[PDB]
Amino acid sequence: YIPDYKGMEPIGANIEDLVDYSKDWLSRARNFSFFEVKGTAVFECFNSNEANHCQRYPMSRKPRNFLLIQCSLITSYKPATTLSDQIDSRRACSYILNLIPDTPASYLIHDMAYRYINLTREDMINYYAPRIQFKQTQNVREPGTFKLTSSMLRAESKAMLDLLNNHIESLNIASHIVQSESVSLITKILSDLELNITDTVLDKFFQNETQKYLIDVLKKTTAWHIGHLIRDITESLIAHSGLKRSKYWSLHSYNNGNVILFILPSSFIRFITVFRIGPGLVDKDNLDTILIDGDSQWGVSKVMSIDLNRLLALNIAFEKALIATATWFQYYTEDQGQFPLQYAIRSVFANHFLLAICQKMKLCAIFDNLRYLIPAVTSLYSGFPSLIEKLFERPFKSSLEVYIYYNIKSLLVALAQNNVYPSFMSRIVYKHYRSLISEVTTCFFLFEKGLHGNMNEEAKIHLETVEWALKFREKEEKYGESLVENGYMMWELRANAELAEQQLYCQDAIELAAIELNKVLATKSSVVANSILSKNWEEPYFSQTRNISLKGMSGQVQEDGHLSSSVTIIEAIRYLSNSRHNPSLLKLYEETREQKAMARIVRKYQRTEADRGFFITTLPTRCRLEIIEDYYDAIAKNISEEYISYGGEKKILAIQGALEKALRWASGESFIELSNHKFIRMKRKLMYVSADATKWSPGDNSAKFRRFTSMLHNGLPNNKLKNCVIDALKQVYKTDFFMSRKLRNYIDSMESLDPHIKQFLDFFPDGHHGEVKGNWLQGNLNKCSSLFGVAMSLLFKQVWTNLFPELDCFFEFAHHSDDALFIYGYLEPVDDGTDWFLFVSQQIQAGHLHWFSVNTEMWKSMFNLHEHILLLGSIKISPKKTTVSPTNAEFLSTFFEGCAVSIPFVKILLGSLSDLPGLGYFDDLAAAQSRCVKALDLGASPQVAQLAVALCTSKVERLYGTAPGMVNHPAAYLQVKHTDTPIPLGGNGAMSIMELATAGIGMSDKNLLKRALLGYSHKRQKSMLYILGLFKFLMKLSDETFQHERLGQFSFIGKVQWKIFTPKSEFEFADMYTSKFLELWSSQHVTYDYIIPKGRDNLLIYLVRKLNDPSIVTAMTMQSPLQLRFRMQAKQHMKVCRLDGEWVTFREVLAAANSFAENYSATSQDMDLFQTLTSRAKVARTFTVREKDQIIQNSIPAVIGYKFAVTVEEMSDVLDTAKFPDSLSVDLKTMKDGVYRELGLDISLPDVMKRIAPMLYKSSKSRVVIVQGNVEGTAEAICRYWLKSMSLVKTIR
């Protein structure tokens, strides 16, 4: 059923009126929006911005600190142990007590060292004892800490403490003295960092290329050992960051007592570093003091306060620097065709390490802006003045920022003078522009995303939203609400000419654009109608994975008056609780039609991986947006070969057609008839423009689509669905935008209300929310906007064709996500342009005044009219990030960069070192290895991905203590090797990227079980039976059934259960059903392990069970500070493993596994279960692990659900889910035959199907792999491509 919603009637829109307006508009002189790129122009922009910046800021003569931890190293650093720590602390404090303090901080250092020396022997025993063996003492109350009362502190120490616990300017970068000082300091630090301090077939290539040219070179550097030392220091800081430990004092010593860390009763943790002065990370002007004891100097730093996100960023600084340097290494070999020299790789490593330890928002913003500044200076025209001006929007405080700014200025001026690409990080020169882009991309990704969302970048977006809303209100008060909403008419533009601004649109332009797009959509009416009707407007709303996800959503207006920040699954459960049925999309929109749209900014502590953007809106708003996007994504799929690229085969046809037509047209000559048969010859040239035209803007108007969808051709016999889309667009026009409690508190805290804060407060008249109109607040209207922009560009093309019929001008365009490429083919006179100007003057004298624009620089007038016609639809081309050039170098990269597939592998490699789920050793290892495999899929070299695998595995083993020589090393408690140990029991797996990418992450355990079976059943080996017993023990510990919504890693042969984070308050509705009820329901409903229920009651039970999943609770509280600190804590000595209904350490689980495996005897059922359980140009080829039989027409989850469907509700849900419900037994027979063919198993036998169905479910899924060449879509072709890419420099075919 579809209601009868009112639509719109076609007004009288004539293309001739717009053509006449364009004639009148082009008859005058129009300013071009972009500036010609010249080295002098860029230099003068930098100089003027320096002069302006230094006069509007308070000048400082003392740069601020940029090194969180200052230290030095002259000898190779041996990693810290508990025994060496005590010896180093004793000798270091003996050194320190022989010093004469002169500052309050140095006095505090002396006092703490004196207290440490005067601790008793039991104090020493309990200080270094594990929490299990720890005993409280009158001086030591927590392990690793000691008590320091105010009696033992001196007057200076007490004064320092009182100052600490009882708590903008810029540097003169225009001056050469500040420049020289900053450059000299950073150059000295970098030079100290670079100073040298005192098998598988892939392994051959690794040890010949990456080990020899990368690892063996950086392994001797000072930065390597400082990275390991900083890892030790940050581990000590993390250990002290515990809830019970942070209230006491701590003292640690590293590098034979040469470095000492003093930790204060710290949220932010406070510490002081005292070190021996030497080569390393030393900034003597930002040190608290330097104490002299003869020929030795000891630098004492200030009290440094650091939070957990920066502490995590500093802990993995060495790994991040090494991964970035390996990426730079791979890109260098791709560019130059050989290996980097030693000095270049050492300098790059030092720069990456310095960037990794200095995590500041200013550096992140600088490296983000550089990514747009580099294209702006390598093109003929761009908006480089604005981008350069953006570099000066924040003060320059530290010397690192000045150094980076000066290097950027030098690089940009050099690039602008060159229209051979200079490198930003070394003395090399690149042959390709992509390498220079990738350098700054890798540098930008070195900065964590945890420093984003601070309490300035949320106020920024609040103010931006409110400012645009107030500008919208001004235009409503000026022209009237009707003109602003319904648009203005063409005769009003011809009389005002101020009406053609952003947030305003012309009705006639919208209708004409819709007509122009109908010209091409009318040849595929049936296809468009079928694509629209295939969106399943009658399918239940909450049975879709996008409507029950973990993405953020707005909740309800609370009693205090604020908008809740909830999850889209909790709101689904809340709706279904009060609803007797599961409504469809249109029925849900009917029910929630009269509820006003609401929006707020997502809380940074409640963000998830599924969250995109900053705004979260209520359920009715998402329903309306989903209606509009189903409709528009259905219509826009039918021009996918022409103007918009989506993915797969039709991901490249748009640009291919556009550029090939441009090249075909340009390879010709034009002839214009001035008089008689005497013609004038013209040379055809091409101009390329890249603009983020489709990108969401806060200053847009959503009402412009209402007349668009009203006039657009959909091929359906009635307007009912079209009118529903119009009405849903009408219901998202006005929104209640709410502030955050954080912003309200921050504004209430300040005493001086700024003039720009007063107006922001007046926007909110009740202090909670204000009305926003026109803007849809980052709501998903991407395909609607892309289609609207395509229609507007087609309207411009028609208008230009009607303007100059005798001129054979050219215009093509393509869209990809927010990016758009426009190609203008213009004419230039051959030889000297005398006949051309004479003809233009004759045309103007004849009354064709619009020929004034086409006189010189035809492409500029083409772009001017295109931009004006786009602005008639409230589309503003960005004057900053739009790039114009006669060739396409920044345009074949920016166009596709922005997709879910063109993401650089740098981000994935650098994110495999953090954000681990914390679900256990096996789950964390699998997550890290899967992230490395994904990075390999995205373009990482096998050697780079292998290095990342090694780094991530070492980090996980260190975290859980399973590395050799550690507490939980499996070989110390099991009678097998470390390679014959199951991954859940502390093993490490294949540890080969080429086998993790092809076979899988958990196939190592299956291979081990295969070896154990084939050894025991053939030779009756005792050790093979021991391995069988270990696997049986793992199966006994935890044997879970596969749920397709679980976010963890599935283990086929058992797992160890680990303690997870317990939030302070459990999620709402999570206690609706008891765990016993959910366990029974899951046992008796095996179909709903592969499909989502369609009924209301079954979907409630399904969603409440999903809410109680430990891998979902973990992902919903991913950014919580408590979980974030819980993941950092070392699980080496913690009782976090489940055994016999009790929480025990991991080595107790290993001892129990050994005991079970010794006294284990194999049975026929066990043997049967074990046998069942063991059975050039960059493109984006998508492959499948084992592919699907052509006879299989339905989806694998649907066939498995049909296999397990028993209840009438389950069978109905399976038939609704299946795309071809009639041919379901035919697919089940085919799958039964295929399983017997390949696996040799019969699924009709009990428990065989339940065990092997997850394998088929994974095999159903497909992956996207970036391959460089003629690689086909088969898995074999991609495997051979990866084997060919095993060598960085030489082909190994």
Residue numbers in the entry: 226 to 392, 402 to 432, 448 to 515, 523 to 675, 700 to 1455, 1483 to 1600
Which of the paper's sentences describe this entry?
The L segment encodes the L protein, an approximately 250 kDa polymerase. The polymerase is a multifunctional enzyme that contains an N-terminal His+ endonuclease, a RNA-dependent RNA polymerase (RdRp), and a presumed cap binding domain (CBD) at the C-terminus. The viral polymerase carries out both transcription (production of viral mRNA) and replication (production of genomic RNA). Here we establish the expression and purification of the polymerase from the Old World Hantaan virus and characterise the structure using Cryo-EM.
We first collected single particle cryogenic electron microscopy (cryo-EM) data of the viral polymerase in the absence of viral RNA promoters. From this dataset, we were able to determine the structure of the polymerase in two conformations comprising either only the polymerase core (residues 226–1600) or with the core and the endonuclease ordered (residues 1–1600) to resolutions of 2.8 Å and 3.24 Å, respectively. In these structures, the C-terminal domains were not observed. In our RNA free model motif F is positioned such that it would block the RNA template entry channel. In our RNA-free HTNV structures we observed the loop 921-EEYIS-925 in a retracted conformation. This retracted conformation is similar to that observed for LACV polymerase pre-initiation conformation, RNA-free DBV, or RNA-free Lassa virus polymerase structures.
